[PDB]
From a paper:
The widespread and highly conserved ParDE TA systems, part of the RelE/ParE superfamily, target DNA gyrase. M. tuberculosis encodes two ParDE systems and several studies on the ParE1 and ParE2 toxins have shown their ability to inhibit gyrase enzymes from E. coli, M. smegmatis and M. tuberculosis. Toxin-antitoxin (TA) systems are found in most bacterial genomes and generally comprise small bicistronic loci encoding a protein toxin and a protein or RNA antitoxin. Here, we present microbiological, biochemical, structural and biophysical characterisation of the ParDE1 and ParDE2 TA systems from M. tuberculosis.
Single datasets were collected from 3 crystals and subsequently merged to a final resolution of 2.10 Å. The ParDE1 complex revealed in the crystal structure is of a ParD14ParE12 heterohexamer, with two full-length (‘primary’) ParD1 antitoxins resolved alongside two shorter, partially resolved (‘auxiliary’), ParD1 antitoxins. The ParE1 toxin is comprised of α1 (P9–W26), α2 (V28–A47), α3 (P49–I51), β1 (R61–A67), β2 (H70–T77), β3 (G80–H89) and α4 (Q90–M92), with 3 C-terminal residues unresolved. α1 and α2 form a hairpin-like structure as a base. The primary ParD1 protomers are comprised of β1 (T5–V8), α1 (E13–A23), α2 (A29–S60), α3 (F68–S80). The auxiliary ParD1 protomer secondary structures are the same as the primary ParD1 protomers from residues G2–E55, with the C-terminal A56–R83 unresolved. The heterohexameric structure somewhat resembles the search model, with the ParD1 antitoxins interacting via an anti-parallel N-terminal β sheet (though noting only one pair of the antiparallel β sheets was resolved), and a pair of ParE1 toxins positioned inside a cage-like structure. A coiled-coil interaction is present, however, between helix α2 of the primary ParD1 chains and helix α2 of the auxiliary ParD1 chains, forming alongside the anti-parallel β sheet that is itself part of a ribbon-helix-helix (RHH) DNA binding motif. Mapping these to the surface of the ParE1 toxin shows two highly conserved hydrophobic patches used as binding sites for a single ParD1 primary chain; one site along the groove created by the antiparallel β strands (1–3), and the other site on the underside of the toxin structure between the hairpin of α helices 1 and 2, as also picked out by PISA. ParD1 antitoxin binds to these patches similarly to how ParD2 was observed binding ParE2, though it is notable that ParE1 does not encode the proposed C-terminal helix in ParE2 that is displaced by ParD2. Remodelling allows conversion of two ParDE1 heterotetramer complexes into a single heterohexameric complex, and for every heterohexamer produced two ParE1 toxin molecules are liberated.
Numbering used by the authors:
A (entry chain B): 2 to 94
B (entry chain C): 2 to 80
C (entry chain A): 1 to 94
D (entry chain D): 8 to 80
E (entry chain E): 4 to 54
F (entry chain F): 8 to 55
């Protein structure tokens, strides 16, 4: 349904787009951001598809989104708050 | 400098199995290896925690309009 | 996006991923996740070079992470991608 | 072994992370065996993919449409 | 089963406790062994399913 | 030299991945050195 992105996460979406555009052009840029949007939409409909990761930081869940990972909390409603979108190289499993 | 420990009965059986399987020689060899694994994990976990903290300190989270964002970015490249 | 081929194993696995997602989270989630994998397949099909070569793993292969999975594919003489396996990320040694 | 890796082993012991040449060598060989097992699993998975049959065009919309219809009956 | 940890691994455990990540030496050690047991069993299943 | 490790080395040579025991060990040490270097580099980066 609805979701929130942190300022950090929004800025990273923009950097991903720009990086992909420079290397691959506008359609590749747009489709990869849409791929990330599908993963964000997946989590926002059922926040529990993400694996709980309190051992990283209390309250967070994580969801693999291809070559990135979404790290997110669930706010005072049923709403997910995407705090960071990190490259998979940082994902510990 | 030099400390001794006793293991519970499940992890003593785990260590016995690792020594029997041939990949480790002693209990200290298994423990020391496991603690190097833990420290390697913790260093990666530290990097993830700092990244999430920087994300929180970023500011309040807001809604985000993918259509508008993607529209604007495509338009800009067209300029 | 352009052409792509999927091996029979890759097709069978797509169905399994759908069934297991369906059984745990319902039809909408199953469809959404498969759509997410389709996006990565379409991206690779449109430019096969976006996936990183991994000849050290197998000559002529490239891989591209997608959702919780990884596409492993070859490139046809025509320039078409051939997706041989769709493997869970736990199997991806990098 | 060679001279560079003898100094690497000795540096590891001097730094307190390892206590013997054997501990470094055995740890490294365990790491290599593990990586080799994972790589072998990957390559055999790819071989099984090649051997499952010739690759075929796919109608993703029809696959999804039919799965959805199958489950709605 | 008992074992000895030298000054370097003891200091690792102590810094781990002093950082508030664990409450006791035994907790650091159990958490280390849990990680290794999970690793070695997965790889042993892989080795099993392989040959 | 232990029986599990000699056997793993023999098995790696037989598969044609390596040509000598020293090669296997050098290859194993290279993996460990690289791993430890990456982790020290991440550790020191965080300390900065």
């Amino acid at each position: 349904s609805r979701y929130l992105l942190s300022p950090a996460a929004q800025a990273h979406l923009e950097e991903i787009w720009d990086c992909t555009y420079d290397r691959w052009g506008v359609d590749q840029a747009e489709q990869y951001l849409r791929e990330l949007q599908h993963a964000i939409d997946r989590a926002a409909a059922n926040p529990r598809i993400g694996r709980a990761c309190d051992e990283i930081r209390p309250g967070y869940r994580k969801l693999s989104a291809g070559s990135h990972t979404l790290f997110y909390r669930v706010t005072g409603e049923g709403t997910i708050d995407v705090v960071r979108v990190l490259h998979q190289r940082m994902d510990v499993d | 400098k030099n400390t001794s420990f006793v293991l519970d009965e499940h992890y003593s059986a785990f260590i016995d199995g690792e020594i029997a399987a041939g990949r480790y020689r002693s209990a200290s060899e298994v423990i020391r290896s496991a603690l190097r694994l833990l420290e390697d994990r913790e260093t990666q976990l530290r990097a993830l925690r700092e990244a999430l903290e920087a994300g929180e300190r970023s500011g309040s989270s807001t809604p985000f309009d993918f259509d508008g964002f993607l529209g604007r970015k495509r338009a800009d490249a067209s300029r």
